[PDB]
Design a binder for this molecule. Structure first.
Ligand code: HEM
Ligand code: HEM
Ligand SMILES: Cc1cc(N)nc(COc2cc(CCN3CCCCC3)cc(F)c2F)c1
Ligand SMILES: Cc1cc(N)nc(COc2cc(CCN3CCCCC3)cc(F)c2F)c1
Ligand SMILES: C[C@H](O)[C@H](O)[C@H]1CNc2nc(N)[nH]c(=O)c2N1
Ligand SMILES: C[C@H](O)[C@H](O)[C@H]1CNc2nc(N)[nH]c(=O)c2N1
Ligand SMILES: [Ca+2]
Ligand SMILES: [Cl-]
Ligand SMILES: [Cl-]
Ligand SMILES: [Gd]
Ligand SMILES: [Gd]
Ligand SMILES: [Zn+2]
Lengths: 400, 402
């Protein structure tokens, strides 16, 4: 009942005893494994279990402070139907949700996270100011710092705080009567919503979208980000002088704004968080996916590669040089970035720390292994166990 | 509803209705997924036999016919008299092809209909076993124009030991435990190498010494057979533009031939049934040569390429790995030995998924093994959601016979 977990490069064995605490059910059954799918009053028992986590975590189990908080939340729910997190419980819950995210390779950093309490917010104009402060703190002139801003929780009878954009920074995507997309094809739908709610569209490949922010029970509001606030890195290559001329760029801050944060039975539908990029996210997935910017053949043609036979590995050669450009360009601009080798080596260290700290670590192998040079990284050779712990980040229906 | 399955490159959506027919359970539960783990009686025989027979008569579009009902009655009576039964020859060919078709971790299944099936069920000794294997290697190699093949030795039966091939593949290089604690040769083969020496083989001292075969006839210790060197086709590795690469003295063999899996057809078990196809270049170029626990050449190649190996951010590992894969492909093509690169292989597997969706309403597939070990998202299978499950006929892992 305790899964055996092997590392095939070293031969080491561990046992995952934490998977026994898996609160929710995932998508897999003895009949069939669905791990590759992207999307696959009892409030009291969740709230209770989270409080024990917290007090165990501060070595104060069953103390008087423990017993007081329990009867506190009980009466709070027997008065409003919900309850309020202490400021520190909220900090601990934000960090745990990151620490519990199976698909995140960056979790070596989970204990260093700047939590911004925005639960006293109302109106989208105040959202916009909270969001802009986050962006300024987290950017930090290119020396990136992790952060999350927690907006008011869901509660009965009242609407929700939602950020309609999937990320704080996104490039527009426009269509034409030859079907194709100019800009980011991933953002065709959000972009027509922005036009639909008032935004006057640009016409470039890297037009930074406005924010569609939604306060409870009102239509969303358009907000433009100040250009000096969004840090961008123009892409060039250390030795291919023509790479600069392709006009590629990307932005500094990966900041996810459409996921729901769950803490002790409470739910926060607006709680955007940000870290810094791993280079393959930009250089492999965003620029080279066939449904994203899809620039691989452009770059290959500029490198004079043989694109008419697969076995020349022209796609592989072009992909590496794009990733080299991404790394060189972020370093040159003094913006924090981490390559997939450094990152996966740090996750291996995270797995070892977590094994000792709590007997295991929920990890999603298909998302931990980088999208280039998979078996050149140590995580490829590491067996993993995927399960859901709480507090947690979850996907949620779009607001429309 | 059955599982919904999306392709993210195209946006298209299928439902895997075939997975509802899965038998032997897998290792996942709703509480935790173990998809990343490498290794995770009369009435039961009859239900398996009946289902297989139904599968056969479906395949030739003769379900419910007179011949279909008589063959079921025939298998039922043999099981009642003997506790077991025998496949018809046609059923054995069909079953071996279905086992390949059902293999979730194989990216080469577009070919599953073109499999040469050698029937060795009347084999009686380890000497005859070796003759069958030599004829298999000769047929499959075909002087570099490789042909997929399987040789099926006698099935498991009560009161008699199994035929087994002790080697994991028919062609494997020796791995000598060096006296430091290091390895000369292939470190994956230290155990089978030491068993061959312990069984009378005089070992060499190179990095690419072909191992002998240890063949086990029922109720018999394994016996040693040396493959004839003219049967074992190899490819010296060179690079089309890096001329020093040839001086590395690298080689690989032409024929990938797995010999230690168990073939299961209609409840019957064939513990010795070696099968072979042709290589995908990343198996050689990336895993066999660049795994840290295998030949581990990545750093030496990069140094020779004059890359900056003192910082990961140069992506020296990715550059040297690409050029090693280029060399593998160039060298097999120069030697006129069949090989397929990971872009063509994964493109053909997408065509197979489409065929199977139409033919059976689904395809069991293990994403982590179908996605190649370099350039994963540059290939189309990366963006294809997959459903992993066990169908029969099947190839299964089995314990090592020692
Ligand atoms: C600090 C550096 C960080 C790095 C390098 C990093 C890296 C990554 C990567 C590569 C993914 C896979 C996403 C994809 O490929 O689309 C991911 C997912 C994720 N990250 Fe991290 N991340 C970082 C920080 C954070 C922070 C600060 C949080 C929250 C406080 C977080 C929470 C998550 C979550 C919930 C996911 C799951 C997304 C999904 O399921 O698609 N990460 N991260
Ligand atoms: C014809 C060309 C073929 C190609 C290109 C091919 C390719 C592959 C590859 C790349 C793998 C993953 C193996 C690994 O990484 O260790 C694999 C696995 C597998 N192949 Fe194929 N194969 C071919 C022919 C065959 C044939 C003829 C059979 C059986 C009749 C077969 C049965 C299997 C099985 C059972 C596995 C799964 C092994 C496991 O569970 O680990 N393949 N194949
Ligand atoms: C903090 C952070 C750092 C980093 N370096 N990287 C990320 C990116 O993490 C995510 C990536 C996605 C991909 C979105 N995808 C759209 C298509 C359908 C499936 C969902 C969704 C999320 F929620 C994420 F947090 C976040
Ligand atoms: C016919 C054929 C063609 C081809 N091109 N390639 C293959 C590779 O097939 C296998 C390869 C291995 C490698 C050893 N591997 C180590 C990690 C854990 C699993 C076993 C084991 C198996 F069983 C296989 F069938 C087979
Ligand atoms: C279908 C498949 O699950 C999908 O392409 C996944 C695979 N692994 C991934 N891994 C990461 N890090 N990010 C992703 O978006 C995906 N996508
Ligand atoms: C731990 C992990 O399951 C293991 O390294 C797997 C991953 N995917 C693989 N995929 C293939 N094709 N071959 C392999 O050996 C492996 N190894
Ligand atoms: Ca038109
Ligand atoms: Cl991104
Ligand atoms: Cl191999
Ligand atoms: Gd030119
Ligand atoms: Gd040269
Ligand atoms: Zn699973």
């Amino acid at each position: 009942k305790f899964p055996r977990v092997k590392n095939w490069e070293v031969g080491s064995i561990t046992y995952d005893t934490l998977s026994a605490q898996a609160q929710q059910d995932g998508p897999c059954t003895p009949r069939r494994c669905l791990g590759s799918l992207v999307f696959p009053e009892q409030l009291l028992s969740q709230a209770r279990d989270f409080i024990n986590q917290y007090y165990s975590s501060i070595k104060r189990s069953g103390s008087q402070a423990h017993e007081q908080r329990l009867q506190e939340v009980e009466a709070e729910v027997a008065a409003t139907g919900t309850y309020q997190l202490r400021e520190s419980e909220l900090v601990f819950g934000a960090k745990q949700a990151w620490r519990n995210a199976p698909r995140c390779v960056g979790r070596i950093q989970w204990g260093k996270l700047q939590v911004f309490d925005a639960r006293d917010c109302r109106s989208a104009q105040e959202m916009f100011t909270y969001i802009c402060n986050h962006i300024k703190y987290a950017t930090n002139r290119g020396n990136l710092r992790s952060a999350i801003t927690v907006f008011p929780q869901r509660c009965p009878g009242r609407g929700d705080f939602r950020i309609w954009n999937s990320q704080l920074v996104r490039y527009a995507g426009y269509r034409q009567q030859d079907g194709s997309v100019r800009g980011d094809p991933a953002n065709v739908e959000i972009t027509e919503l922005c036009i639909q709610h008032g935004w006057t569209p640009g016409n470039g490949r890297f037009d930074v979208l406005p924010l569609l922010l939604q306060a409870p029970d009102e239509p969303p509001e358009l907000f433009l980000l100040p250009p000096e606030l969004v840090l961008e890195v123009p892409l060039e290559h250390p030795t291919l002088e023509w790479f600069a001329a392709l006009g590629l760029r990307w932005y500094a801050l990966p900041a996810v704004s459409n996921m729901l944060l769950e803490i002790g039975g409470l739910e926060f539908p607006a709680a955007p968080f940000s870290g810094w990029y791993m280079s393959t996210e930009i250089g492999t997935r965003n620029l080279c996916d066939p449904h994203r910017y899809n620039i691989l053949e452009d770059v290959a043609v500029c490198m004079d590669l043989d694109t008419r036979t697969t076995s020349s590995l022209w796609k592989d050669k072009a992909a590496v040089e794009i990733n080299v450009a991404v790394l060189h360009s972020y370093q040159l601009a003094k913006v924090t970035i981490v390559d997939h080798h450094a990152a996966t080596a740090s996750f291996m260290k995270h797995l070892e720390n977590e094994q000792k700290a709590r007997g295991g670590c929920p990890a999603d192998w298909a998302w931990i292994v980088p999208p280039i040079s998979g078996s050149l990284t140590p995580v490829f050779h590491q067996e993993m166990v995927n399960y859901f712990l709480s507090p947690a980040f979850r996907y949620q229906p779009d607001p429309w």
